[PDB]
Symmetry: D2
Subunit: 462 residues, 4 copies
């Protein structure tokens, strides 16, 4: 009994329907493979690379308490290093968890069918979704189009796979020679040397590792799930889940956040505390958006499999740099649009709606190439998914700054935290200081120019 | 397409494997049967009757939120009433859970028989035990007999069940005709109006219902599981888990107690938190006693002699009434056993230490018969589970020595016997022999505001 | 220049105006004189004495942080005693505080007129009361007669006392070997020997020392004083302030608490929190009664000229000593009565509402001589003063079926002290002997075996 | 019987010996006079002028509960109105509290010189100090030279006054000439009204709040004053400066409870606390040294400046100074100053000396030219204390920034741009070699103003 477990994005030792199977047959030794030779343009971002650089030491320490080791390996020809350890340990099946980005379904399918050459087979599993992306059908076996009708379907199926248990103890493979070309994390070029501390001060407002995701989940529900309904439009403060980074990397089983959040939604329904019950629907509706991402990405091919889906690939964005240089620096001249970008670079996370503020501003007002923008988004955000992000820059494809600010920001407290220079305007007309009278600004300490960035462009022509 | 569940001691829906398994094949219809006289002498006790009357009503709301209603039949011909309720819907399935009491075992092999022979399908499930007591083997087909040997093997076979989720939208069928006599719990014979006002005062210390179980669990594991290894032996107040009733009635799925109490055990091991790693494995071994009862009842053969298997069937040695009239009134004299019985009579629960002190003195020194022993616990103890009771007495078949390891400061005796508010611990645990002056200066004159020790410990 | 500060019942450093006045002239060194040969019948009780022994030792450490050393002395005659201190110190002035009990006014009256013969200036300083018992008169200069006729007159006073700070550094003065006839505490003997191991169990519910006082008052006012209206008549739990013993021994200054609430009340006086405003008023009146007590004990006849009003020794007494030893052991039957004495004997303190029940008991429903009723209270109350206490046995000189719901609605007070009634329904606990047998036997209470019978019929 | 107490800078009813001194007698009538033209330059700034608005709104609502009333007289001339209200009410006493600033010193003496004509006696009471500087004459009348020399004699001679009780009853007793409302007594202008809105987030005036910050501070954080006082980060300071300035809390009562817990920790041998206490009462301490020099000599011995800073020429220009309140001085340790001081009206002491010392020693502006601006925006504008520190001044942005900002998170809280540099660089970005610059998000000149200075 010898089996290899290949790890991609399931760095958790609780509710893994790939790992959990392996503990039955016999001993194992896991494997992480990093091959930057095949990703083409889909190479990871700048801090997302940082993320994997951190949880690994957290995870690999975990097997040292369950009696084994995660054994990292770099290479170009993943098949060969697979062919290597197949030669050095004599296991027969290589279990693993599915992936759904279309830079992976080509990688998996080819390596498996080239793995039968040695009479070597494989069983793939589902360890990151609620429903299969091939389960939901219409009446005639077609793909849905409206998520709302989609969510009703998944909401009344109630069929899951299993919430498996955690294994008791691993069966460890002894060792092997050093002809696999890598042993330690540093040789993996996840993070460059010139930016090692500079890309490390995000550790104040973050702490990866599934051990952390457990603390953050339990502390979340009992404390502030009752107020998620009356906070999801509040951009200020930690007013939402903050479980975006963990989910993309598979550190907390989303089919576990679906139970431990479900078993509270029933309690308030029993007590008829309809306030708390109403907050639970938007949350679970939240996760359901994520299914709409991948399910479409598999039923339809991603963005038509080309540059963009059907219409926005050759739109004449102004072929200019400094505005694009200005869009990210935080000097566009607007309170909102410049607000978060001073914070995006600060901790690599923004509210879910503010992103939809900043996003539409560039392509629809600055007229800059989204490829220059989305690439920056992939370049900077922690949890920069491949599938949902391209969904994000489709709903943003098809806004008076005054009105939407008050609803999003009622009392002018957000801008005062990420733009301290404007801490002396009245709560009225703060979000659009260029519209107020000239003399009231003199009443404050805001003078556009040398002490505050004038607006790059205005809506009068925009 | 149509099924009829049948709850016996699984008053819970989160992880009810005999429940979700019915939700997928169509529609369901819950039921609860009461066995008034087919229990013979195994009629549940007084207090234990009360806990059920508070658990069901709370539970009846819970399934109501899911869109269904629990029905309640009271008869001594279970196969008959179940055979009647079948013809109201024509279901081909009747699910339940596996139980190992000597009276429902025989009740179960027949009900399937009268159903399989009559030909209507039925599935059982397992939802009360991690390991089924037929799985564990020693070499080929023999059982173990040393619990440490048993537990040493359970820690090395992780193959077990899979905790399901709770369903979403349950659909009953019709509930058409009440000819099955859909009796109400108030119409169900659970208590007596004469004694009813007294028993309701138990709510000052407990609150039944499965939903309260969860709010206690997270209240437990996140707060005091880290130091349970240094609070199990301190009899005073609330130290232990206080889960014993909720696990007897299936108020909470035991396995989920074994997940959320393991993940908080692997974290400390990774962190070198050597203290917490000790207190974790003195709780998960705590549950381990629980299975070991079940594994002796079924796979070891039952009491071939009377209920007490092969130890005490000849030497009761007494038929007194006044002594038994004195042992349960807290007028014994020993200021440790007295502090218990008033604790039991006041809240219907004791700590595991005291449950082995009031017993040992109840037989080794008071000369009373064992049979009188078990039933009095059997009538009042909230968590009176029979399998975990014969184990309680076969473990047993001066207090100052044992007065130190369990309660050193003597804080306990000054909570339930306030007459001794002015005695130091050097004489609180045995007043009969203290110096004559110390009793005078304190508010204790033997016999007048406290009775002497009922039997001399020194000789007998 | 050189002075001798005298400590009698004001063991505090903050706001001791007799001391701060001597914090300007020169060097000071404290003194505590003891003589158990001048009080005779006024010898403070058993639990009273332990308060001194557990407050002085707390005080002495506080004065040594400022460069001083409280000396302690025994003597048969204080006059000859203090003259010894002149023998070595050779100081010049003498400052003390005023008292009002009938034993001190005679002694201290001799002190002034017997030290001027030695050409020694001597002063007093009234730092224990709010208003002088002699300054308040009627319009015609006669005294008042009734409390409420007096309290309104005391809410508009002009010539107030003064608040003081604590000095920084005290210049001590070392004279010679300690003294004649005595030592620190050993020869004064605040406690006998064998009584010591028992008394220490009082520390669980009290902690002497003025340093603990300030922690309490700040903890009491800004946390509990808002609800004093709704807790003044609830017997269970720490309803009232729990300040009585400190304010007797002067461990806190009465003119500092009275300020700390008035400045507090005016805050609520602005926001229209009358319910918070009104509860503040009762505590204010609570100080009014106590001050009222010192009034009539000075300008009205000395203890009314007798323990019984002037003679009051002829009416029916029927001295049956059996009940007395029967009463104070808490075995009388009336569960509220025996509730008290099982708290009075375990923490040396009761709620004042309770103290008017039992006090009515020993004389009315039992006919015992009142002097037997003081000898117990004086012997075990931790705040057994002389002046307010005589008021207690004078304010009195009612059916429990009613007042039971008056002061303990749900009956929590009985079940905390008497646990054997833990299974009566609440509407019967306050009077069991009216119960029907179908509920006594149905509960665990058998009148006459474990819980004593009524000592006497209520219609007697 | 009636007496006219005269509230000047003691807006509180607790421990006010200029008020309760009337209570022994009888009816009173409080009045508050303002004159925006007799103070000349000392016309209080925008910051302090706003603070006055809340307290009087808070005191008037306070005294009325005692069955009384407090008008709001305004005048062209102070001495005139008092004799005017005299005739209307016909009292015999006009008590008030002292103020030891020379601009108002002579004023009270001017009214002590006119009241003896009418034959109504006056009584001034000590309501701001533990030691009214007349008694502390040492060595027969030669004042001290340092502070600690001054702070020592008072200790061994620690005689004080008696903390007087609060009052119980205030039975009180036409147009007090051309009586004016609250808003005609202009403390604000029309424009600056809404901009004063956000300042409420930082403070909440009123004597009824001073006690809370007092009692909360004494029993919660006074242990950590010895270890937090040299930390710019967070709230590691009492923040009791304004509440103490306007007489909203009796300064001696603060010394009382402080000394109480001090000796308490001496009992339990908590040696760590006992240094936390003695350091703190030193904090109130040097305040007393301010008025001690301001009495025995007028401030700077005659005028606003001692005798010197008229030579030693300045960098006569405003575009330099125009940067300062704009907070573009390059050094984030300074530009973290103005961005706060502009937005809160308060700065920690240590930052205050590193910003104050800058304008004269590096920017080289006129010293008075910067002091005046502080009077406009610091919520604690006080001549007898502002001139103290400015006379206290007359280093390295990294060598000193290390003690008071170990992680720099104080800068990443007020300077949202620089949130991505290592802690050992964020005080002087120009030293960070270029490899750590473009990788980080800052390029000086566009993403952050270049330091307009030569560092040496
Ligand atoms: C004479 C006698 C009779 C008893 N009768 C019962 C009975 O009817 N029902 C009952 O549940 N327990 C019985 N016990 C055991 C004991 O009362 C309980 O197991 C335990 O004290 C309950 O406290 P707890 O819930 O805090 O236990 P904790 O140890 O704090 O944790 C709760 C869990 O501990 C388990 N556990 C701990 N010790 C034992 C044990 N010795 N045997 C079985 N399970 C154990 C329980 O199953 C329960 O699920 C008896 C013991 C004796 C000596
Ligand atoms: C029969 C009888 C006997 C009493 N014997 C004593 C005694 O020996 N010693 C003693 O100190 N008090 C005695 N009292 C007064 C009162 O019962 C106690 O002071 C009791 O402690 C009041 O509760 P408290 O002080 O804890 O309430 P708190 O709120 O803690 O105290 C209120 C304050 O007001 C005073 N006070 C309140 N009510 C009264 C009152 N009716 N008379 C006098 N002062 C009052 C208390 O001394 C205290 O300073 C007696 C009262 C009665 C009716
Ligand atoms: C150049 C300079 C000018 C200043 N101008 C003023 C001014 O106009 N108004 C003003 O109120 N304060 C002034 N200060 C004092 C200093 O600004 C205060 O410490 C700070 O503004 C408030 O902090 P704090 O009250 O919480 O200090 P804490 O120590 O927590 O407060 C204790 C109290 O002691 C006094 N105090 C504290 N530090 C000092 C100090 N360094 N010098 C004098 N007294 C002090 C204050 O009354 C303060 O409220 C000045 C200090 C300097 C160096």
């Amino acid at each position: 009994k010898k089996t290899i477990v290949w790890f991609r994005r399931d760095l958790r030792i609780e509710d893994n329907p790939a790992l959990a199977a392996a503990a039955h047959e016999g001993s194992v030794f896991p494997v992480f493979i990093w091959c930057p030779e095949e990703e083409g343009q889909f190479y990871p971002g700048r801090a997302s690379r940082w993320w994997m650089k951190q949880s690994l030491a957290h995870l690999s320490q975990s097997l040292k308490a369950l009696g084994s080791d995660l054994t990292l390996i770099k290479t170009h020809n993943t098949i060969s290093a697979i062919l290597d350890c197949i030669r050095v340990t004599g296991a027969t099946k290589v279990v693993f968890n599915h992936l759904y980005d279309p830079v992976s379904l080509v990688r998996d399918h080819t390596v498996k069918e080239k793995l039968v050459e040695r009479g070597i087979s494989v069983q793939s599993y589902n360890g990151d979704l609620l429903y299969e992306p091939w389960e939901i059908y219409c009446e005639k076996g077609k793909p849905f189009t409206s998520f709302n009708s989609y969510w009703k379907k998944c909401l009344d199926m109630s069929i899951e796979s299993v919430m498996l248990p955690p294994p008791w103890r691993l069966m460890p493979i002894t060792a092997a020679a050093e002809a696999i070309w890598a042993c330690s994390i540093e040789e993996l070029g996840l993070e460059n040397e010139a930016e090692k501390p500079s890309n490390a001060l995000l550790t104040r407002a973050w702490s990866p590792g599934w051990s952390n995701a457990d603390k953050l989940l339990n502390e979340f529900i009992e404390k502030q799930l009752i107020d998620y309904a009356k906070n999801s439009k509040k951009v200020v403060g930690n007013s939402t889940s903050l479980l975006s980074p963990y989910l993309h990397f598979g550190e907390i089983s989303v089919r576990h956040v679906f139970q431990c959040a479900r078993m509270k939604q029933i309690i308030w329904a029993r007590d008829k505390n309809s306030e708390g019950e109403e907050s639970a629907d938007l949350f679970l509706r939240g996760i359901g958006l994520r299914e709409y991402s991948r399910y479409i990405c598999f039923n339809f091919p991603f963005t038509h499999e080309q540059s963009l889906l059907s219409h926005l690939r050759f739109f004449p964005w102004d072929a200019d740099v400094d505005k694009f240089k200005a869009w990210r620096q935080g000097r566009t001249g607007y309170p909102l649009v410049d607000a978060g970008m001073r914070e995006l670079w600060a901790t690599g996370w923004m509210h879910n709606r503010i992103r939809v503020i900043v996003s539409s501003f560039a392509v629809k007002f600055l007229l800059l190439p989204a490829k220059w923008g989305m690439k920056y988004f992939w370049d900077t955000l922690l949890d920069a998914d491949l599938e949902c992000d391209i969904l994000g820059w489709q709903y943003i494809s098809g806004d008076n700054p005054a009105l939407q600010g008050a609803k999003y920001d009622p009392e002018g407290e957000y801008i005062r935290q990420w733009l301290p220079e404007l801490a002396r305007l009245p709560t009225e007309w703060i979000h659009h200081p260029w519209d107020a009278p000239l003399t009231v600004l003199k009443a404050s300490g805001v003078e556009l120019g040398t002490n505050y960035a004038k607006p790059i462009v205005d809506i009068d022509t925009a």
